[PDB]
């Protein structure tokens, strides 16, 4: 059994917690955030967004204990200070957003861990990866990046398109939930001044790299991606609009029939595939990373496409965390 | 001055009733809903949107008087009953969303008024005019349609990339706010199975002409263009984003001069222009048709590029359904 740590208990930590506890090849021996143990206990029990925990919850002793298992909990600003080697944790889950280089990841290492996988992609050349798309690339590196929740929705979509038809050039759009950076009235974001704007109220446009990060993960298409996000008052679920020009012509339907056919394949468990009336709720707990929407996309002709793919952000991206954990501990 | 009436005193016909307010040329005689007058008063009066109403607002006999002057209020759910000329309404704003081909719309000119202007696209082949783009193609007709929000947002920026650089192709999605059609929870929508789902608590894809209908009022990019919509939970202000191919190569800074130039020429106070960082509420009650954005766009190429733009859904379009009724009575 892999045993892990969490950096920060936050959206994705406490999903990526939610993710390990029906995986037999995972354990989580530590958490670290900012909080008392009661409180990570009550961050845990209860969610707003995808409901009560389903397991048992107490503190003993200023632990948590998880269904029997005890979790050491710290409230270590600095992570050089976690001592992960004494309860045996061999690879960190990097996700407080804040350690997204290869110095300030290698605190961990400093601290005891082997590996780190950070959940956002890295401010530095640390390599990222994508399950299903560039994950067999890995080369034994301690230290690196599952990437974005968008890159990990657009990458496993393009690779098919591309291989298929071949991508000439393509833009994206997703229109993304509010997260945790955005603020509930108009307040303070010195670095993002449309992100300071209060969230329930606005669309707001932001900035992504993360269509030019699918030419990272997919080389073949470096150069010809790239793309911007919408913000708007949702509080999960979030969804891609590709517009795509193509190498070779396809009708939609032969679009559809591809990536179908690698849903059921190749893709299997990360792209998914649906023909029904779907709206963002649906896809909420959705553990894919892409999800194929048939009717809501739209062809102008037969090299000239409008895709469309839905990704629960917090949800598929916490699994494919773990999947990527395990993947670096076998390789 | 022109006298109207407005059949259908929603969104729209009160956005267009506010619009009027200021202009001197139009004069509203007459409005008709199911509703009684001090119901229609209250309506008037206040606005979750935009606000109290700055005029007074009266009920006397069973008419409105605002700012002095007397309304007739009707509540005929058959528009041929209207007796239009007994108030000397000569065009009507036809707006209750449900007379959108000749046959029904025709029934405002059998109760007596001599030109009618829907205020969405037609469900038939009734004309259709966008301000600033090919009014001047008008010729007299009795009956005709001022498009929809999202057509009045696009054309104008169409109309200027393809005269300077020239649309290859382009696909569109516009991100749109909340609408009267849609419900407040999950409720029924037969012919619209997406959009009976909750507002509030969901991005739901809808479909579009507004994308097709760009090519009936500019010739040239018939069949150059389509799109799709995503609805959102905020009440008003949209935005249109325009990924399209060039004919010739473009710098984004000389779309953006090209742009400007038509902000402050042909298309001054339709077509606007920002550079600031902004978000929708900023343009909550912002009388242009289509507000472009330079921040929030990106090129990938120099023929290659993806262009945004906002609208307020019910102010620009209810600002332009009064110019085309000046423009119509005038030529
Ligand atoms: N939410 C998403 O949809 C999503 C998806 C993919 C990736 N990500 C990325 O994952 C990261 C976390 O995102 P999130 O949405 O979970 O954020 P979040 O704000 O919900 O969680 C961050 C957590 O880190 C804790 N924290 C802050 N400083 C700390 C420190 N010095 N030591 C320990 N803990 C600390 C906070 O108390 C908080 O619980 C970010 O890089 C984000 O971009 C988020
Ligand atoms: N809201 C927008 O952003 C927007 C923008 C452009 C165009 N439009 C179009 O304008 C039209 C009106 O839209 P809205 O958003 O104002 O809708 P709305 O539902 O707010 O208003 C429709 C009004 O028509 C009234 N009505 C219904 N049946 C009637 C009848 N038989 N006789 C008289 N009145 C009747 C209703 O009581 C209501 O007040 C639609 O075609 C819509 O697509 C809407």
Redesign the interface.
Same mark, same amino acid.
């Given at each position: 059994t892999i045993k892990i740590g969490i950096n920060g208990f936050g959206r994705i930590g406490r999903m990526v917690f939610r993710a390990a506890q029906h995986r037999n090849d995972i354990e989580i021996v530590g958490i670290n955030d900012l909080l008392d143990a009661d409180y990570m206990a009550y961050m845990l029990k209860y969610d707003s967004t995808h409901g009560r925990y389903g397991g048992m919850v107490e503190v003993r002793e200023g632990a948590l204990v998880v269904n029997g298992k005890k979790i050491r909990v710290t409230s270590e600003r600095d992570p050089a200070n976690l001592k992960w080697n004494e309860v045996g944790a061999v690879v960190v889950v990097e996700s407080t957003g804040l350690f997204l280089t290869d110095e300030t990841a290698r605190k961990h290492i400093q601290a005891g861990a082997k590996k780190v996988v950070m959940t956002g992609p890295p401010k530095d050349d640390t390599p990222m990866f994508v399950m299903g798309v560039n994950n067999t690339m890995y080369k034994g590196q301690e230290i690196v990046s599952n990437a974005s929740c968008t890159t990990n929705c657009l990458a496993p979509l393009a690779k098919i398109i591309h291989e298929k038809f071949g991508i000439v050039?393509? @833009?994206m759009?997703t $229109?993304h939930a509010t997260t945790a950076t955005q603020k509930t009235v108009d307040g303070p974001s010195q670095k993002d001044?449309?992100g300071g704007?209060?969230a &329930?109220?606005?669309?707001?446009?932001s900035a992504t790299g993360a269509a030019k990060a699918v030419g990272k993960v997919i080389p073949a298409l470096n150069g010809? @991606?790239?793309?911007?996000a919408?913000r708007?008052?949702?509080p999960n $679920?979030? $969804?891609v /609009?590709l517009?795509a020009?193509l190498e070779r012509p396809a009708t939609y339907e032969q679009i559809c029939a591809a990536i179908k056919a690698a849903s059921e394949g190749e893709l299997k468990g990360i792209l998914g595939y649906t023909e029904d009336?779907?709206?963002?709720?649906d896809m909420n707990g959705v553990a894919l990373t892409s999800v194929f /929407?048939v009717? &809501?996309?739209?062809s @102008?002709?037969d090299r000239? $496409?409008?895709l469309?793919s839905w990704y629960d952000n917090e949800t598929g991206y916490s699994h494919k965390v773990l999947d990527l954990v395990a993947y670096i501990s076998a390789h």
């Open positions: 050039e393509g @833009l759009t $229109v001044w449309r704007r209060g &329930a109220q606005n669309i707001i446009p010809r @991606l790239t793309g911007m919408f708007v008052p949702t $679920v979030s $969804v /609009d517009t020009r009336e779907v709206v963002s709720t /929407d009717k &809501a996309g739209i @102008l002709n000239f $496409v409008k469309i």
